[PDB]
């Protein structure tokens, strides 16, 4: 399962009135293990916000 991270969407964002959205960038990362050379991927989205 070769995960591929495409970018996040904010066209539908609805501000709530207690937090301001700085951004939501993403990062594809990979983790290796003792059993074999094959890597295990993941996609992390980091919601950043200021009060």
């Amino acid at each position: 399962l070769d995960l591929q991270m495409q970018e996040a969407d904010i066209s539908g964002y609805i501000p709530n009135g207690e937090w301001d959205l700085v951004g939501i960038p993403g990062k594809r990362s990979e983790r290796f293990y003792e059993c074999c050379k094959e890597p295990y991927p993941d996609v992390t989205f980091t919601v950043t916000m200021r009060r």
Partner: protein, 103 residues
């Protein structure tokens, strides 16, 4: 008319546990994205962030293919949860109490 025939043909031997690749050694590419709609809650007592989001998965299935010219008008089909393969993408850092918050 053509829909019935197509739906019959597509599920003739389909298995929803089988990753849909022609060559089992090659990988299946899955494009994963996201769509945030609002921030719902930012608790500091339980250290939990509550969001509203729509996931977006896109992949390719080798066994669900057909010729448009032989099925005029049938350009798409729709399958429920347990009738075809979906990837097991889910939130590692979930605190939901059902662990899969998705519909």
């Amino acid at each position: 008319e053509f829909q019935r025939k197509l739906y019959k043909e597509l599920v003739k031997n389909y298995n929803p546990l089988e990753r849909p690749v022609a060559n089992d050694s090659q990988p299946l590419t899955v494009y994963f994205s996201l769509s945030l709609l609002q921030i719902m809650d930012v608790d500091e007592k339980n250290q939990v962030l509550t969001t509203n989001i729509w996931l977006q998965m896109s992949w390719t299935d080798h066994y669900l293919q057909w010729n448009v010219s032989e099925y005029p008008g049938v350009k798409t089909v729709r399958f429920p949860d347990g009738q075809i393969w979906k990837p097991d993408i889910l939130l590692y850092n979930s605190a939901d109490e059902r662990f899969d918050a998705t519909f």
